[PDB]
Design a protein around this nucleic acid. Structure first.
Ligand SMILES: Nc1ncnc2c1ncn2[C@@H]1O[C@H](COP(=O)(O)OP(=O)(O)OP(O)(O)=S)[C@@H](O)[C@H]1O
Ligand SMILES: Nc1ncnc2c1ncn2[C@@H]1O[C@H](COP(=O)(O)OP(=O)(O)O)[C@@H](O)[C@H]1O
Ligand SMILES: [Mg+2]
Ligand SMILES: [Mg+2]
Ligand SMILES: [Zn+2]
Ligand SMILES: [Zn+2]
Lengths: 310, 312, 394, 309
DNA sequence: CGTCTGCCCGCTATGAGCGTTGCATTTATCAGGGTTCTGGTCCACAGTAT
C-alpha cells in the first residue's frame, strides 16, 4: 500500500484504517484486508486493537509515528494502563505488537469480562459540526467510546444508531454525514456529565505512561486515606458515613445507570471490596468515584501521583 | 464365488413356489444336519511325526487357521441366516408378465359394479434385522465365514441378465464415520463383480442422504440377498456427528434399503441401541442372540462340550 | 407404475358432476365393506400341518408379513383419507378451465420466487390437512399402505393428455436438510412414473426458494391427489432457523397451491408443532375398557391364535396364557406378533409342540433383551417413568 | 417430455410448444429445446414449421393427432399448397416432416415471396375475450397471422406488440402479458375485411388437400375466364376494362396497404401477367383480388373446383 | 428477344472478443472437551461482655 493516511488528532486507528479504503476505492472488505494486512483472519476491534506494527510499517517514512505513539495516543490503552499495574502493562504492550488478539484482552484482565455490551456505533452530533468545519472529515473520537459512559465530556448525551461492531467481523466502517444526521434530544444527567469531564483529561496525560502503583500500594493508600479522613471504625469502616457521602455526591439513578448500584444489605459490595485487601484490578469508574467522593478538590493526575509515590 | 450358472430346484414351501432367486439357491437342510457340515480338522496327525523341527513348527503354526468344531449354538444362527436370506426375496419376484391385463380387468369390473373390492399393488415396508453380541475372542467371524461359505456369492441367470449377488460383507472403521460406511459398500461390490461403482458414485461429492439413496438402487439391479456389518462397536460416539444423527442414519438405512441387515458387535455396543423403542424394535426385529464362553459345568456334572472341545 | 386406462363413473354428488379426476376414481365403499376389504390373513392348509419340520418352520416366519386385523380407528382413518383425496379435485377441474389457471399462477411463482403472487383471482384452493401421532409399533405405516392400496395411483386419460397421480409417499431426511426433502420428492416421483426429473431440477444450481416452487409446479402438472410425509420428527435435528420454513411451506401449499398434505410423526414431534392442522391420536390397546375386558383385544388374540402349525396344539386359549401374553407385550402391536412367532419357533426346535406360560417367559427373557427397559417402564405405570425416555406413549 | 398439451381449436404449433414450456416451468429456452427436441440448434418458426415428427411422437398415445392432421389443421400450409402445384406440394408434405428448415422455405419460395416477413407479433382484443371466457387460456390464432394481410376476418384490424420473432431464434413465447389492451379504432377500408372474410374459409377446407392445378391448366383456365367474361380481343388483351373493374371493386388506397399497386405505365404489372403465360408461382392474394373483382358469384373453394374442372 | 457478361447474392469458413459453465477451493455450521479464571464460601482469629 502506497498512501496510508496519517491519523487525525484524537482518532482511533479503526477510523484511520477505514478511511484508508475510502481514499482508494476498495469496496469489498476481503480486498481491503488482503491489501492492508495480508491476512483474512484479522478481526476489527474498536479500542485496544492488535496486529500493530504493520500499521507502523506503512507510516515508516513519516518518522514520528511509531508503535509507542499509536498505542498511547490513538487507542484506549491509557484508561487501562495505570490501574492494572507495572507487572502486566509491559506484557500487554509487547503483545499488542504481534498477532495475538484475545491474549491482549486476557492480559488486561479488567477488560477480560468475557462477552462485552453496548457495541452500537455511538456519536455526538455537536462535535461533528466542528469536525466538518475544521478538517472536512468526520471520524470516530476517543471521547465517544468510553468503556461505560455514553456521554461526551463537553456536550452531553450520545446519539446511538443500531449497527453493531460484531455484526460484521471483517468490515471497517467509516462515518458518513448524510447517514449521520439523526439528532434528537434525550434525557441528560449533570452528575454523569461532570464525571465524564473529570475523567476525560486522563487520556491526554503523559504521566500515565510511566507511573503505575501496585496492589499493596493501593491498599496502603486507601487505609491511610481512611485513617486521615477520620470516618472509620477500629481498623475498619463505619460502612455508613462513606456510603452517605457517596449518596450525597451521586444519585441512585446514576449508579443504577452505571451498573454499580450500591448494595448495603449484602456483604459483597464493590466499595467493600475496594476497602478490603486488593486481590484483582478494578475499573476506572470505581477508582474515580472513590477519589471524587473522598478527595473533592484534587485532580486525577496528582491523585494518582500521590497514590503511587508513597 | 464366481459366476456360477443357475440350475433350478423345486422348494417344498408354497410361498417360495415360482421365484428364480429362491430356487437357484442350495436346497433346504435340517438344522441338526447342517451344523455338522461346518466341521474341519487337520489331516496330518501321525504320518508327519518323524521330521525336522522347523517343518514341524511350520505345521503347528497352522492349527488356529484350519481347526473348526461346531457347538450347540451354531444351529440356531444357521437357521436364522437361512430364513433371513430366503425370506427377503418374495417381494422381488422378476417373473411376471400378466399384471396389466389382470389389473385393468379388475378396474373395469369394480367400475361397472360387478365386483365390490379390489387390491391393485402394495409397497413393501422394512426388512428383517438381527443382532449378535458377544465378548471378543469368542468367534463371531470365524463362525460366520463358514456359515456363508456353503452359498455361492455371484450367480448368473441365463434367461434374464441379472447377476444375483447372494451376500455381501463390510466392516466398520476405527473412525466411525458415517461417510465411510456408504463408501465400503461400493468397494465391496466392486471387489466381487469387477465393476466401477466407486468411481461413478463414491468419488463424486454427494451428501450422505444422496449416497444412501444410491445404495438402494444398485442393491436392486443386482438382487442382493443379505448385508453384514461387522465391528459395530466402533460407532459408540467415536466421531462424525451427534448421537441422534448416528441413530437416525441406521433407522433411515433400514427403512430405505430392501435387503436384510445383520449386525455384529461387542457387549459395549448395546448401549447404542438401548436408547429408544425404535432402535430396540429394529435391532431385535428377528430376535437377539447373546453369546457366552464355555462353562465347565451346568448342573453338578461337567459340561460335555468342554470335554469334546478339549479332546479333539 | 400401475398405468391403467380410465373409465368414467356416475357419482351421485352434485359437486362431482363433471370432474374427470373424481369420476375416474374407484367407487367408495360402505362402513361394513371397507373393513372387509382391508382384512387379510395367511391362508394355511390342512396338509401343511403334516409336513417336514423345515418346511413348516419356513412357513411360521411368514405370519407377520401376511397378517392384518383392522380395529375401530382404521375405518375412521380410511374415511377421512378418502374424503381428503376426493374433495380436493373440485377446485382443479380441467374441463371448465380451472386447472389451467393454477398452472399460469405457478409460472410467475417460479419466475418471481415469492409464493403468494397471483394472476387470476378466481383460482381457489379446496385442500385440507391431517396430522397423525402414535407410539412406535402401533402400525402407522402398514395401515396407511393397506388403505392407499385400494387406489390405482397412475391413471392415464385419453381425451386429455394428463396422467393423474392419485397419491405419493416420501420421508424426511435423517439429517434435517432442506435440500433433501425437495430431492426425495423428485426421486419418488420418477420412480412411480419412469421419468427423469431429478436430473432436470435437482442437478442444476438452484436455491431453496426456487426448488420449493419447481416442486409445487411439477406437483400440479400431474394432478397429484395426496402427499404423505413419513417420520416428521427428523425436522428438529436441522440447522437453527431451518425447521420453521418447511412448517410454513407445508401450510402455504394446502392454503394456496391446493395439494393436500398428510404428516406422520412420533410423539417426539409435538414439540416442534405445539411450540411453533388436524390431529388424530393413536394409542396401544388395553384389556380393561371400563370394568370389563375389551372385545377388540380378545378378537385380535383369538384371530391370531388360529395360525399355529404345531402338531399337538391346544384347541382353545386359556385365560392365564392371555394374561401372560398381555403382561409381557404390554399391548403394543409389533411385540405381540414377534413374541408369538419366536415362541412357536422355539416350540418346534425343542420338540414339545404346545405353547405354555413357561415357554413364553423363556423366549421373552432370552431373545428380547434390548426392548426390556421401555416395556418395564410402561408396565410400572408411574407417570414420571413413562414420561422418561423418548418415542413412547404421551 | 412426459405429457404434451393437446392443441386447441385453430392454434399454431408455436403456441402449443410455448404452453408446454409454461406448464412444466422451464424458464431457460435451451432447456426447453433439450426437452422437446433432441438438439439445441433448431430454430423457432412461426408459420410453416419443420421437425413435425417429434411432435406427433409426443402426441402418439392419443389416437387423434397424426402428422397429416398437423400439416393441414395447425399450420399455414392450406393457403400455399393449392397454388404451387401437385409435385411441389407432395415434396413439401414429404420433406417438412423430417429435419429440413431452409429446404421447404427455398422450395415454396416463402422467404422469396416476402423480403420482410411480418415478424412483429399480433393481438386481437375481441378474440382474446372469447378465448378467456371459453378456454381460460390465451393462444396465437391462425386467422391473425395471414402472410401479408393483417386483418382479423370477423372484426376490425390487429394491434402489434412490436416485438419480433427474429430477435430470439431459439425462444418460444406465449401470450401472457395480462392481456394487454389498447384501443386502435383506425381502419383503412372495409373491403380489406371483406377480402379477409372471403379468404378465411380456405384455411379449413377438406377439399383443399387434393386440388392443385398445373401451369398449363392455370393458363388455359385464365384464357377461358377471359373468354367467358368477354373482355378479350384477337391475340391481345383489353388492358383497360379489367383495370376499371378492379378500380371499381378495390380502392387504390386499399391496394396501397397490401403492398400491391397497379402500374399502367410499365409492363411489369401482375394484372397483365396473371392473364399471360404462367411461368412462376403466384401468391394467394394475387389470385384472390382477381377472384373478388371479376367472379364474385363463387367462393374460394367453388372457384378452385371450377378451375380444376 | 436468350444465354454470356456483368451483377447480385445467399452462403460459407475464419478469427478476436465477450458471456456462460463445471470443478475445486474456501467458508460456514455444529458438537465435544478442556483448562484456567474468577466468583462466592467457610474457617480461624482478634476484640469485646460475665
Ligand atoms: N392391525 C394389525 N394387524 C396385524 N399386524 C399389525 C397390525 N398393526 C400393526 N401390525 C404389525 O406391526 C408392524 C407395523 O408397524 P410399522 O410398520 O413398523 O410402523 P410403526 O408401528 O408406525 O412403527 P414406526 O413407523 O417405526 S414409529 C408390522 O410388523 C405389522 O405386522
Ligand atoms: N468352534 C471353534 N472351534 C475352534 N476354534 C474356534 C471356534 N470358534 C472360534 N475359534 C477360534 O477363535 C479364534 C478367533 O476368532 P475371531 O475370528 O477373532 O472371533 P472374534 O472376531 O469374535 O474375536 C480363531 O482363530 C478360531 O481359531
Ligand atoms: Mg472379529
Ligand atoms: Mg413407519
Ligand atoms: Zn461532543
Ligand atoms: Zn378478432
Amino acid at each position: 500500500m502506497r498512501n496510508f493516511p496519517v491519523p487525525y488528532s484524537n482518532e482511533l486507528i479503526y477510523s484511520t484504517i477505514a478511511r484508508a479504503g475510502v481514499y482508494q476505492g476498495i469496496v469489498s472488505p476481503k480486498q481491503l484486508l488482503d491489501e492492508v494486512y495480508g491476512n483474512r483472519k484479522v478481526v476489527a476491534t474498536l479500542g485496544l486493537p492488535s496486529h500493530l506494527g504493520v500499521i507502523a510499517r506503512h507510516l515508516h517514512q513519516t518518522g514520528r509515528y511509531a508503535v509507542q505513539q499509536l498505542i498511547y495516543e490513538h487507542t484506549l490503552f491509557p484508561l487501562y494502563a495505570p490501574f492494572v499495574g507495572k507487572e502486566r502493562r509491559d506484557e500487554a504492550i509487547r503483545l499488542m505488537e504481534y498477532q495475538a488478539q484475545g491474549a491482549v484482552h486476557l492480559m488486561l484482565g479488567v477488560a477480560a469480562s468475557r462477552v462485552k455490551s453496548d457495541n452500537r456505533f455511538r456519536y455526538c452530533p455537536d462535535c461533528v459540526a466542528l469536525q466538518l468545519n475544521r478538517y472536512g472529515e468526520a471520524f470516530w473520537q476517543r471521547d465517544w467510546y468510553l468503556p461505560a459512559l455514553p456521554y461526551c465530556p463537553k456536550h452531553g448525551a450520545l446519539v446511538f444508531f443500531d449497527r453493531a461492531v460484531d455484526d460484521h467481523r471483517h468490515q471497517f466502517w467509516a462515518l458518513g454525514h448524510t447517514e449521520l444526521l439523526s439528532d434528537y434530544p434525550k434525557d441528560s444527567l449533570s452528575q454523569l456529565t461532570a464525571l465524564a469531564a473529570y475523567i476525560a483529561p486522563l487520556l491526554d496525560a503523559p504521566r500515565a505512561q510511566e507511573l503505575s502503583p501496585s496492589l499493596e500500594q493501593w491498599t496502603l493508600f486507601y487505609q491511610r486515606l481512611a485513617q486521615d479522613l477520620g470516618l472509620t471504625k477500629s481498623k475498619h469502616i463505619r460502612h455508613d458515613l462513606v456510603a452517605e457521602r457517596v449518596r450525597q455526591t451521586f444519585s441512585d439513578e446514576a449508579l443504577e445507570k452505571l451498573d454499580l448500584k450500591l448494595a448495603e444489605n449484602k456483604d459483597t459490595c464493590w466499595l467493600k471490596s475496594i476497602f478490603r485487601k486488593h486481590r484483582k484490578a478494578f475499573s476506572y469508574l470505581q477508582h474515580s468515584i472513590v477519589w471524587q467522593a473522598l478527595l473533592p478538590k484534587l485532580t486525577v493526575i496528582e491523585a494518582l501521583q500521590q497514590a503511587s509515590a508513597l | 464365488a464366481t459366476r456360477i450358472q443357475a440350475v433350478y430346484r423345486d422348494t417344498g414351501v408354497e410361498a417360495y413356489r415360482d421365484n428364480p432367486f429362491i430356487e437357484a439357491l442350495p436346497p433346504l437342510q435340517e438344522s441338526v444336519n447342517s451344523a455338522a457340515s461346518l466341521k474341519s480338522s487337520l489331516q496330518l496327525t501321525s504320518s508327519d511325526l518323524q521330521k525336522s523341527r522347523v517343518i514341524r513348527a511350520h505345521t503347528i503354526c497352522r492349527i488356529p487357521d484350519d481347526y473348526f468344531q461346531p457347538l450347540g449354538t451354531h444351529l440356531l444362527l444357521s437357521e436364522r441366516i437361512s430364513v433371513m436370506i430366503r425370506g427377503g426375496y418374495v417381494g422381488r419376484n422378476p417373473k411376471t408378465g400378466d399384471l396389466q391385463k389382470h389389473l385393468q380387468n379388475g378396474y373395469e369390473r369394480v367400475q361397472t359394479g360387478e365386483l365390490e373390492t379390489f387390491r391393485f399393488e402394495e409397497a413393501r415396508s422394512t426388512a428383517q434385522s438381527l443382532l449378535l453380541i458377544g465378548c471378543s475372542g469368542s468367534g463371531k467371524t470365524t463362525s460366520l465365514h463358514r456359515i456363508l461359505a456353503t452359498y455361492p456369492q455371484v450367480i448368473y441367470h441365463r434367461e434374464l441378465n441379472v447377476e444375483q449377488v447372494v451376500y455381501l460383507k463390510i466392516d466398520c472403521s476405527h473412525n466411525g464415520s458415517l461417510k465411510e460406511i456408504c463408501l465400503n459398500f461400493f468397494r465391496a461390490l466392486d471387489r466381487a463383480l469387477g465393476s466401477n461403482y466407486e468411481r461413478r458414485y463414491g468419488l463424486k461429492r454427494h451428501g450422505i442422504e444422496t449416497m444412501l439413496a444410491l445404495m438402494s438402487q444398485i442393491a436392486n439391479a443386482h438382487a442382493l440377498g443379505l448385508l453384514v456389518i461387522d465391528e459395530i462397536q466402533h460407532l459408540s460416539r467415536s466421531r462424525s456427528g451427534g448421537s441422534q444423527e448416528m441413530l437416525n442414519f441406521f433407522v433411515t438405512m433400514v427403512n430405505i434399503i430392501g435387503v436384510p441387515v445383520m449386525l455384529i458387535g461387542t457387549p459395549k455396543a448395546r448401549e447404542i441401541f438401548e436408547a429408544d423403542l425404535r432402535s430396540a424394535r429394529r435391532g431385535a426385529g428377528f430376535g437377539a442372540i447373546f453369546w457366552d464362553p464355555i462353562q465347565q459345568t451346568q448342573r453338578g456334572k461337567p459340561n460335555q462340550e468342554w470335554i469334546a472341545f478339549t479332546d479333539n | 407404475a400401475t398405468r391403467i386406462q380410465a373409465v368414467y363413473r356416475d357419482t351421485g354428488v352434485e359437486a362431482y358432476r363433471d370432474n374427470p379426476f373424481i369420476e375416474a376414481l374407484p367407487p367408495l365403499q360402505e362402513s361394513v365393506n371397507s373393513a372387509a376389504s382391508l382384512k387379510s390373513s395367511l391362508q394355511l392348509t390342512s396338509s401343511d400341518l403334516q409336513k417336514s419340520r423345515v418346511i413348516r418352520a419356513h412357513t411360521i416366519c411368514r405370519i407377520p408379513d401376511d397378517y392384518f386385523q383392522p380395529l375401530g380407528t382404521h375405518l375412521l382413518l380410511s374415511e377421512r383419507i378418502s374424503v381428503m383425496i376426493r374433495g380436493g379435485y373440485v377446485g382443479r377441474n380441467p374441463k371448465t378451465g380451472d386447472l389451467q389457471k393454477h398452472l399460469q399462477n405457478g409460472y410467475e411463482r417460479v419466475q418471481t420466487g415469492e409464493l403468494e403472487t397471483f394472476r387470476f383471482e378466481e383460482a381457489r384452493s379446496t385442500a385440507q390437512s391431517l396430522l397423525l401421532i402414535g407410539c412406535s409399533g402401533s402400525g402407522k405405516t402398514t395401515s396407511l399402505h393397506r388403505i392407499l392400496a385400494t387406489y390405482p395411483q397412475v391413471i392415464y386419460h385419453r381425451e386429455l393428455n394428463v396422467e393423474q397421480v392419485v397419491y405419493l409417499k416420501i420421508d424426511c431426511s435423517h439429517n434435517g436438510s432442506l435440500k433433501e426433502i425437495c430431492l426425495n420428492f423428485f426421486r419418488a416421483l420418477d420412480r412411480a412414473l419412469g421419468s427423469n426429473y431429478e436430473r432436470r431440477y435437482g442437478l442444476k444450481r438452484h436455491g431453496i426458494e426456487t426448488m420449493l416452487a419447481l416442486m409445487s409446479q411439477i406437483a400440479n402438472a400431474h394432478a397429484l391427489g395426496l402427499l404423505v410425509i413419513d417420520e416428521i420428527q427428523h425436522l428438529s435435528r436441522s440447522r437453527s432457523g431451518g425447521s420453521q420454513e418447511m412448517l410454513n411451506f407445508f401450510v402455504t401449499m394446502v392454503n394456496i397451491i391446493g395439494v393436500p398434505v398428510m404428516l406422520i410423526g412420533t410423539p417426539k414431534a409435538r414439540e416442534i408443532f405445539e411450540a411453533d392442522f388436524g390431529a388424530i391420536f393413536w394409542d396401544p390397546i388395553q384389556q380393561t375398557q371400563r370394568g370389563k375386558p375389551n372385545q377388540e383385544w380378545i378378537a385380535f388374540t383369538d384371530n391370531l391364535w388360529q395360525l399355529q402349525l404345531l402338531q399337538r396344539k391346544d384347541a382353545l386359549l386359556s385365560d392365564e396364557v392371555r394374561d401372560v401374553w398381555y403382561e409381557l407385550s404390554q399391548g403394543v402391536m409389533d411385540i405381540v406378533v414377534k413374541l408369538f412367532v419366536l415362541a412357536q419357533l422355539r416350540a418346534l426346535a425343542l420338540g414339545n409342540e404346545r405353547i405354555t406360560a413357561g415357554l413364553l417367559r423363556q423366549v421373552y427373557q432370552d431373545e428380547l433383551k434390548p426392548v426390556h427397559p421401555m416395556l418395564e417402564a410402561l408396565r410400572s405405570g408411574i407417570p414420571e417413568r413413562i414420561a422418561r425416555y423418548s418415542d413412547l406413549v404421551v
